[PDB]
Design a protein around this nucleic acid. Structure first.
Ligand SMILES: [Mg+2]
Ligand SMILES: [Zn+2]
Ligand SMILES: [Zn+2]
Ligand SMILES: [Zn+2]
Ligand SMILES: [Zn+2]
Lengths: 1242, 652
RNA sequence: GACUUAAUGUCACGGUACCCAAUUUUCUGCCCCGG
């Protein structure tokens, strides 16, 4: 009679478009999915339809189950013997079956007393339908002694509701790249997992065997099985198009990509970021607001347009709204912007033999089930194609590859380890364990008898899914341009990653006679234990250390299928009850299940020790960053409410103990930054980084780090910060600003703040990271990686951003003990004197009064060299090395730590008064490398007649044209590389070219420390006189005067007057106008390193000359230069040159001489005053009192009724500002003449 | 405009890539740059791109598909993909306006290449219609463009009358000798001039390596000639087989091309159809065709690229073959010792028959018998599937396979084909290498084993027979501890014997040509590269290649392998077994013979072989198997399983 | 019911969306005379 059968799924099952047997051959997707659930289109629209599983597929599964059941019992079921059945049809006798069996048929000894026929037949021959009236051509259901109806989905239904299209893969084992791909529909088993069909059975003799086989069918349609006998998207796309058009009218279409990334990242911040206006607003110095959130879209800011868009789309949810708005923005950006790929990936799908397999009599067949947890040891990635490309039934000449990549989730947004990926990883690791496996052929009429395929035929896995379902973190990656060491345009690409520590249910079922030593080896290789890392590499981006999973909580239970087959069938093998199998104890186990006490240990497994364990070698090491490390997260700075321009990269970590993402994100250097530092480090020493292309490339960089044809043999994991608790303030606010070359003041729009990790030489950041070396590294490539690792230790490659101003400088590395023993075994003064100036030298008793600043009126000739020095290699004829410089303060030095505007804590008693501490990191005093670099660069740009790199061109006068038109064309900042680079921009870099000098932070070494001043509320402090904005109107009084040149400040002890005026600065001047700061003293010594690479012989010499120009020439650094503060002398403690040798004084002097000749070459023991502009420069930087000379240098007062004015001097600006007293031209001439007297004006 | 300047630079790059002097590795980079210019220029212009630029991209995509060599047996989907991309790129030039002449030349030439590698996506009907459309559009200009010769002659194979264009086609000096021969055969239907030009084609084929495009079309022409039932195919297939045999001589390296096997199948079938002393010399020729096929094994391009004196010769050969691919588009058989009989097996795929070419040295007689291997192959696949699962317990499936070898090959037990007392050298072919032909049982009641009458030896090919030592016995063991512990302590083992944990260097260290070398290690097989199948010795093991280059002290040495052949060679998913065992490498490095099991056998029997071999090394292997349970396949199939495994690979 | 199976034969758990890419380059938290 009719048996009603419920067919339920416990993992996503495969769906295929239904085509009749004739029409199915025309489609390769449908011939691929003949074993899947079938989808008919039930309409004219090709959108809604009906899912069903053919009864031929259920019958095929049931007949397979009957074969296995009768093979377990040597050919009988409940005592009635069965013959071998029939599984071969003669073509001449009749038509072949619609499906031809390629697999081995399980056969036994046919112990049936009589040959089966129409009159009498064994239960097997009844279940096969061998001897009923029904044949290959269906007539009616009464002819079927055993009948299988079509199993209809039990739940019109749209295809997109039930199935999601997914691209699957066939990764080549040897290269690690996918040979081809193929698409599939994964139907949702949680909502559409039950299929109902009727199995009619007229012959009662086969009832017990049929019901047992129903209970034995383990898989159907690609999924685990239990057989029981019973539109806002379009509106958001239009609005994203509106936003993209609005950005285009702003010429900010390139910002649409980061806007898409930021809006997608907003799903991690909840809807409150867009309703409570928590998006950053930018600095108050810029009236335009935030560079991204304040872009006008249809006349309203993007931050409020986003609020309106969210209010319109509140129904679909915050995560869906942000996800699909960012996705629409990314897709529109990809459409408008259109690395170049000539051919796409290949979408590839897919001898009549009967192979009787007769298992030995009395062989014990068991089913071992491994239940465990797959823990994400690293952030994981399971690549899924774009949802707009993956719509089932609408799946998508010019190869426009996608740049943003999504992670694979299910409908509930939970991370899933797909059975396909886990199976591919298991096949790869079993092939490693066996040492020999096939490349999976796809249309073989013969089963592959490779040991990997033999065991993989008995292995059944499950689709893992995590209970955790919070949005993935987007990992943005860039490609660095090797030549300019900058970001390649359009090279920004991102993937969505799942958190590390995320845990997945692992189910492995092995159905065989003995548990293989290789599968046990693979399970042990994946397992994590005390002193071992889990080595299950699942998914994509293994090279950037994504998807290294660990097997944990592993329990192996075996079913005894020979004596407990009825208990197996009763429990359905616990095919949806493996999570309960993991939680339950031994006492609660089903009757057939016993714990497997024979799982061998790692040291007992030959495949593990010789094939799997040595396959990847861990090189764990700790990076010591005695520097403020800033690996910026550019998107996070757009989404966090801190109003911060550059913040350190941090990542979300899942905690399995708390079953949540840890509230405090872990700061880390990304594994991609970790990987790319090594890749350039290897590529720069091998010269492979300068190769134009890497296609069919066997270079050392392509062998180690892979390319688009071969996967990398090295896999880099994140460099986690393991010191964060040691810092009372990890994040350190550091303010940087660009100083106008002419005005000597900060550009208002050029101010920016970084937020690095507060690493310092005394208290460095420990960054623990690791990489994995594949087995088979050559000795020379292993030598390259250690050389790259030693290059990082030596400081050749600062981590993160702003390495040129001292960020991310690696103080050292510490190799962990577990690193392989082979790996760890291979790892002065400037005699020159300036003559000074005539006026102060001849002034005994210091009667003349000099202007605090003068301008360097150098010529228009700027040598812009077009042959830009590449960064892609260490040129042999060029010089690379490190300069250990000592910074001595000749006058008190002020480097304000502007992060704390109330560092001295005196705004409570003096509101509005700006008080700063000296710049410090973790309490130790430092000069930021940006301050040292910008003061070398201004000197080097003056010495080499470079362009005005920082210039307020848009600033107007009061007049016909702004300062940009008023400045000479050759003196403008070097823009691009098509025109040449000036020596300053060639050495220190532009925004299109990374500079070849890096300046470290200057750590305080010794000296008298602070300038102690009695009567100041902090004794270390000194209330400064007001620092008013420089006035270009004085330097250019008329419309005919040009820009006088680079403003330098005189070296004088005018701070002594400020210190003596301390009691009256506070009482007289307004507290808001002036500041008080912690003041360093004279004679304080700072040590800083200048790291240069690819420097010319003369450029290192000119840099060494710029650092230490002479006995009586020094630099002005920090706040209060017009007041005499900041006179600092640099002397070279040591100079080192790599390819690491300590450069002797003779070779140093040769460099300086070589730079001296290059300067006279552009002009038309070296003597620097012979060149007129250097003589004027070195007079401006000439230091008296270093000699019975204390020149009095200060600014004239405004009127007679002004403080700090001596009666009868007539020095006031009323006298000096009048064209009647002195002509404008001589005022400019006196402004451009260093050390020219100004009270007795010359 | 700026488009013409960029297209002209792309054209001059394509002309450089079309230059036969261009290296194939440099050609691919050149087409990359030309397509970088052309696609990017197409990105901006979109549909408004001029037709000359769309011809340029189609030309570039035709050259792209030329640089995509088949990495395996199947034709790559990237190659199809590149021709498909060129066809829809040239369709934009067909649909929007000499230019149409140049557009149809590249459209039709792309379609000819697409048709021959993908008959479904571009069938003969569609190709014929568009080939004619090029002809009526002026694409019959054979004097200056070599592509119109391919357009017209492809139409000749399609049955389209080209009598009018025949005279200018022959006059054109750009036409190939094969193309001239195809024109004579298809247009004029005269066989004398088609013979004269094909002979000049095959005479030139002795120098063009088998990767050349001309090899595929020549064999495809004879396939057409065979399918046309013409008499030209018999003489042609033999003549181009001789060119292949000549070209094969230039490590046993052979380039894999799909039509190679059908060439030998056709040449074998041609000589078989021509088979007093003339008839016998034809059967002799059958064994030389069969021996030439088994002399080398084709290596897939992926395995050739995934491969050190041999490194130089491999790079020379791989580069030469890859270059010639893209250039087209821009011991005596009777020297057997007295008293022996050599059975050369050949499995024809063109016909369903296997052929056994026997040579009686006493009678100096060549005779051959055909057998059906399809039913036998299924019985072997049943054994191989059952053995790979149950090993020894599949001894029942070995008996039926051995009973199938005696039933499908009754001539093994016929006295006329193979005499009674004659030692038999088996030179099997394809899956017959995995067949225990010594263990075959004749189709009769109480059928005796083959080895009970004849001492059987085996050879991968006749070309592995050698002419030829010390008295030292060397044991190189890298096996598990449980096995051969007693055999270790044998005193006869010499001082070169590394009796535990032997390494690759230990095998290379042998220098005195020991009388017996006994390597007891595990075997592992590279499923695609015979060269990378290794003996699991210490320090990484030693591969087939490493034996070829690094083992020199085994001249005339008798080798006993503890590794089963099933470990050494991959299982068979097809009738072909072109995988040489590591024993074949031992034969090439001078070893007189290699004894090993054909399948996994318990180490006690392997040890029992060695101890029996330690005394009277000149013992015949079949005499051991008769007295050690080989004759008992009815009583104990497991004991028949263990003794039948042992076979001798070599020849005195 | 039909949509929607074919029956003596479905290895599709026969196929890791894989592979390559350093969020970075540049920028002194500087400072005097006219509304
Ligand atoms: Mg029937
Ligand atoms: Zn039966
Ligand atoms: Zn396989
Ligand atoms: Zn490379
Ligand atoms: Zn410049």
């Amino acid at each position: 009679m009719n048996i009603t059968v419920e067919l339920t799924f416990f993992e996503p099952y495969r769906l295929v478009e239904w085509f009749d047997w004739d029409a199915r051959k025309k489609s390769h997707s449908a011939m691929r999915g003949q074993a899947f659930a079938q989808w008919t289109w039930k309409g004219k629209g090709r959108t809604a339809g009906k899912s069903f599983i053919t009864g031929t597929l259920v019958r095929s599964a049931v007949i397979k189950a009957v074969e296995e059941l009768l093979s377990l019992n040597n050919g009988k079921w409940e005592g009635v013997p069965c013959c071998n059945g029939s599984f071969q049809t003669d073509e001449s006798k009749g038509k072949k079956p619609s499906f031809l069996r390629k697999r081995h048929t399980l056969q036994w000894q046919a112990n049936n007393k009589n040959i089966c026929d129409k009159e009498e037949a064994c239960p097997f021959c009844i279940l096969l339908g061998r001897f009923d009236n029904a044949g290959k051509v269906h007539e009616r259901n009464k002819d079927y002694d055993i009948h299988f109806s079509n199993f209809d989905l039990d739940h019109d239904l749209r295809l997109v509701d039930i199935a999601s299209g997914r691209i699957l893969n066939r990764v080549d084992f040897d290269t690690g790249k996918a040979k081809d791909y193929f698409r599939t529909w994964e139907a949702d088993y949680e909502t559409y997992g039950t299929y109902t069909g009727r199995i009619t059975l007229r012959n009662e003799h086969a009832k017990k065997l049929l019901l047992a086989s129903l209970g034995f069918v383990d898989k159907l349609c690609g999924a685990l099985c239990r057989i029981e006998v019973i539109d806002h998207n379009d509106e958001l796309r239009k609005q994203a198009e509106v936003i993209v058009e609005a950005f285009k009218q702003n010429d900010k279409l390139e910002k649409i990509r980061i806007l898409a990334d930021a809006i997608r990242t907003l799903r991690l911040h909840g809807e409150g970021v867009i309703e409570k206006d928590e998006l950053p607003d930018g600095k108050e110095e810029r009236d335009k607001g935030h560079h991204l959130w304040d872009i006008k879209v249809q006349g309203t800011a993007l931050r409020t347009k986003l609020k309106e868009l969210w209010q319109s789309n509140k129904d679909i949810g915050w995560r869906k709204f942000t996800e699909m708005l960012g996705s629409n923005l990314y897709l529109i950006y990809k459409k408008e912007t259109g690395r170049f790929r000539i051919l796409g990936d290949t979408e590839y799908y897919s001898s009549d033999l009967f192979i009787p397999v007769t298992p030995p009599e009395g062989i014990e067949t068991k089913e071992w089930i491994i239940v465990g947890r797959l823990k994400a040891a690293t952030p994981f990635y399971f690549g899924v194609q774009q949802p707009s490309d993956s719509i089932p039934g609408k799946e998508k000449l010019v190869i426009n590859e996608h740049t943003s990549f999504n992670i694979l989730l299910d409908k509930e947004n939970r991370y899933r380890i797909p059975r396909s990926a886990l199976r591919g990883a298991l096949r790869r690791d079993l092939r490693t364990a066996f040492g020999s496996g096939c490349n999976v052929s796809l249309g073989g009429q013969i089963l592959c008898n490779c040991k990997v395929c033999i065991e993989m035929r008995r292995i059944t896995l499950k689709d893992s899914v995590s209970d955790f379902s919070e949005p993935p973190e987007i990992r943005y990656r860039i490609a660095k341009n090797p030549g300019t060491a900058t970001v390649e345009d359009g090279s920004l690409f991102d993937i969505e990653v799942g958190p590390e520590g995320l845990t997945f249910p692992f189910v492995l079922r092995y159905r065989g006679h003995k548990f293989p030593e290789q599968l046990s080896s693979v399970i042990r290789y994946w397992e994590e234990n005390d002193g071992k890392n889990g080595m299950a590499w699942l998914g994509g981006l293994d090279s950037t250390g994504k998807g290294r999973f660990a097997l944990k909580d592993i329990k192996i239970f075996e079913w005894d299928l020979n004596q407990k087959i009825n208990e197996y069938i009763k429990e359905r093998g616990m095919r949806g009850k493996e999570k309960e199998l993991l939680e339950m104890g031994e006492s609660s186990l089903p009757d057939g299940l016993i714990p497997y006490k024979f799982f061998e240990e790692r040291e007992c497994l030959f495949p593990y020790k010789e094939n799997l364990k040595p396959q990847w070698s861990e090189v764990q090491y700790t990076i010591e960053v005695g520097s403020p490390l800033l690996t910026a997260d550019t998107i996070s700075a757009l989404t966090e409410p801190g109003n911060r321009d550059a913040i350190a990269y941090k990542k979300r970590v899942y905690n399995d103990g708390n079953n949540a993402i840890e509230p405090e994100p872990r700061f880390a250097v990304k594994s991609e930054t970790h990987r790319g530092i090594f890749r350039t480090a290897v590529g720069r020493r091998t010269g492979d980084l300068g190769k134009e292309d890497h296609e069919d490339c066997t270079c050392d960089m392509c062998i180690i780090f892979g390319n688009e044809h071969e996967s990398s043999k090295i896999r880099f994991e994140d460099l986690e910060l393991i010191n964060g608790n040691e810092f009372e303030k990890l994040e350190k606010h550091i303010d940087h600003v660009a100083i106008d070359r002419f005005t000597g003041g900060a550009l208002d729009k050029a101010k920016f703040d970084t937020y690095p990790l507060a690493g310092s030489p005394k208290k460095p950041l420990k960054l623990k990271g690791r990489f994995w070396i594949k087995k088979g590294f050559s000795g020379d490539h292993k030598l390259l990686i250690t050389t790259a690792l030693s290059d990082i230790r030596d400081g050749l490659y600062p981590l993160g951003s702003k390495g040129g101003v001292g960020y991310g400088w690696v103080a050292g590395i510490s190799i962990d003990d577990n690193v392989p023993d082979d790996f760890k075994e291979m790892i002065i003064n400037n005699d020159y004197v300036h003559p000074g100036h005539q006026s102060p030298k001849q002034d005994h008793k210091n009667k003349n009064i000099y202007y605090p600043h003068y301008f360097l009126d150098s010529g228009s000739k700027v040598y812009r060299e077009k042959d830009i020095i590449t960064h892609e290699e260490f040129t042999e004829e060029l010089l690379s090395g490190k300069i250990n410089c000592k910074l001595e303060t000749l006058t008190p030095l002020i480097i304000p730590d502007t992060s704390d505007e109330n560092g001295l804590k005196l705004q409570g008693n003096k509101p509005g008064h700006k008080n700063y501490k000296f710049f410090n990191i973790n309490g130790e005093l430092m000069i930021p490398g940006s301050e040292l670099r910008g003061m070398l660069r201004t000197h080097f740009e003056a010495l080499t007649k470079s362009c005005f790199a920082i210039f307020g061109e848009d600033s107007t006068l009061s007049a016909s044209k702004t300062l940009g038109g008023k400045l000479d064309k050759a003196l403008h900042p070097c823009t691009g590389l098509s025109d040449g680079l000036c020596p300053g921009c060639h050495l220190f870099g532009t925004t299109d070219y990374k500079g070849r000098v890096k300046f470290g932070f200057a750590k305080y070494e010794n000296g008298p420390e602070w300038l102690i001043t009695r009567g100041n509320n902090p004794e270390r402090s000194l209330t400064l006189g007001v620092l008013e904005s420089p006035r270009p109107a004085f330097s250019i009084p008329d419309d005919e005067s040009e820009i006088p040149g680079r403003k330098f400040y005189l070296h004088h002890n005018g701070w002594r007057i400020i210190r003596q005026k301390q009691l009256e600065i506070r009482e007289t001047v307004q507290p808001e106008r002036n500041v008080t700061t912690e003041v360093m003293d004279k004679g304080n010594v700072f040590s800083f390193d200048v790291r240069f690479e690819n420097l010319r012989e003369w450029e290192l010499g000119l840099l060494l000359q710029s650092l230490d120009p002479g006995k009586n020439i020094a630099h002005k650094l920090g706040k209060g230069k017009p007041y005499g503060f900041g006179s600092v002398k640099i002397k070279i403690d040591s100079l080192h040159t790599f390819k690491i040798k300590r450069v002797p004084q003779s070779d140093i002097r040769e460099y300086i001489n070589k730079g001296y000749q290059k300067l006279i070459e552009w002009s038309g023991l070296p003597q620097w005053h012979v060149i007129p502009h250097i003589d004027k420069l070195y007079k401006l930087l000439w230091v008296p009192f270093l000699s019975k000379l204390e020149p009095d240098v200060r600014y004239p007062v405004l009127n007679e009724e002004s403080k700090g004015y001596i009666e009868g001097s007539d020095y006031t600006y009323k006298k000096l500002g009048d064209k009647d007293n002195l002509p404008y031209k001589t005022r400019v001439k006196g402004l451009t003449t260093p050390w020219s007297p100004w009270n007795p004006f010359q | 405009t700026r488009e013409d300047i960029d297209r002209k630079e792309a054209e001059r790059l394509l002309d450089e890539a079309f230059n036969p002097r261009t290296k194939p590795v440099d050609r691919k980079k050149i087409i990359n740059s030309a397509l970088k210019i052309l696609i990017g220029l197409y990105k901006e212009k979109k549909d408004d791109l001029t037709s000359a630029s769309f011809i340029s991209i189609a030309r570039a995509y035709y050259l792209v598909s030329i640089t995509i060599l088949p990495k395996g047996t199947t034709i790559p989907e990237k190659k199809k993909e590149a021709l498909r991309k060129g066809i829809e790129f040239i369709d934009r030039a067909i649909n929007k306006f000499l230019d149409s002449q140049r557009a149809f030349r590249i459209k039709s030439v792309l379609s000819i290449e697409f048709n021959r590698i993908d008959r479904e996506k571009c069938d003969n009907i569609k190709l014929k219609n568009l080939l004619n459309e090029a002809v009526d559009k002026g694409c019959t200009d054979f004097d200056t463009y070599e592509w119109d010769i391919q357009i017209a002659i492809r139409l000749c194979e399609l049955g389209v009358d080209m009598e009018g264009h025949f005279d200018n086609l022959i006059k054109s000096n750009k036409a190939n000798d094969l193309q001239k021969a195809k024109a004579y055969y298809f247009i004029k239907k005269d066989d004398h001039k088609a013979k004269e030009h094909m002979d000049k084609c095959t005479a030139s084929l002795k120098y063009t390596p088998c990767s050349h495009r001309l090899w595929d079309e020549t064999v495809g022409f004879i396939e057409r000639l065979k399918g046309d039932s013409s008499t030209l195919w018999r003489d042609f297939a033999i003549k181009t087989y001789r060119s292949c045999r000549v070209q094969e001589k230039e490590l046993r390296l052979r380039w894999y091309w799909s039509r190679h096997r059908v060439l030998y199948d056709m040449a074998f079938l041609a000589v078989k159809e021509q088979a007093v002393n003339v008839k016998q010399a034809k059967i002799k020729k059958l064994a030389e065709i069969s021996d030439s096929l088994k002399s080398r094994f084709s290596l897939r391009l992926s395995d050739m690229e995934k491969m050190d004196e041999s490194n130089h010769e491999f790079k020379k050969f791989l580069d030469k073959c890859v270059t010639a691919y893209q250039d087209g588009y821009v011991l005596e058989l009777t020297q057997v010792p007295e008293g022996w009989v050599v059975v050369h097996f050949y499995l024809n795929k063109l016909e369903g028959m296997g052929n056994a070419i026997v040579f009686d040295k006493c009678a100096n007689s060549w005779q051959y018998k055909e057998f059906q291997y399809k039913e036998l192959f299924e019985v072997f696949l049943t054994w191989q599937a059952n053995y790979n699962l149950y090993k020894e317990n599949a001894a029942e499936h070995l008996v039926t396979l051995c009973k199938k070898i005696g039933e499908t090959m009754p001539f093994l037990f016929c006295d006329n084909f193979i005499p009674n007392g004659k030692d038999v050298l088996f030179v099997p072919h394809d899956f017959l290498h995995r067949l225990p032909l010594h263990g075959s049982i004749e189709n009769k009641t109480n059928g005796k084993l083959f080895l009970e009458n004849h001492s059987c030896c085996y050879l991968p090919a006749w070309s592995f027979a050698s002419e030829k030592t010390s008295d030292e016995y060397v044991l190189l063991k890298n096996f598990d501890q449980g096995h051969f512990e007693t055999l270790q302590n044998n005193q006869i083992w010499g001082t070169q014997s590394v009796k535990d944990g032997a390494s690759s260097d230990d095998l290379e260290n042998i220098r005195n040509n020991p009388r017996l070398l006994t390597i007891l290690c595990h075997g592992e097989a590279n499923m695609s590269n015979p060269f990378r199948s290794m003996l699991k010795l210490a320090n990484g093991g030693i591969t087939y290649l490493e034996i070829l280059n690094s083992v020199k002290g085994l001249k005339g040495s008798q080798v006993i392998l503890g590794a089963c052949e099933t470990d050494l060679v991959p299982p068979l998913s097809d009738v072909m077994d072109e995988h040489y065992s590591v024993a074949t490498a031992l034969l090439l490095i001078g070893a007189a013979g290699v004894v090993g099991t054909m399948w996994k056998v318990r180490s006690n029997k392997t040890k029992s072989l060695i101890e029996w071999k330690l005394e009277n090394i000149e013992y015949k292997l079949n005499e051991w198997q008769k007295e050690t349970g080989g004759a008992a396949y009815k009583d104990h199939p497991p004991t028949f399983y263990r003794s039948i495994a042992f076979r001798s690979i070599g020849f005195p």
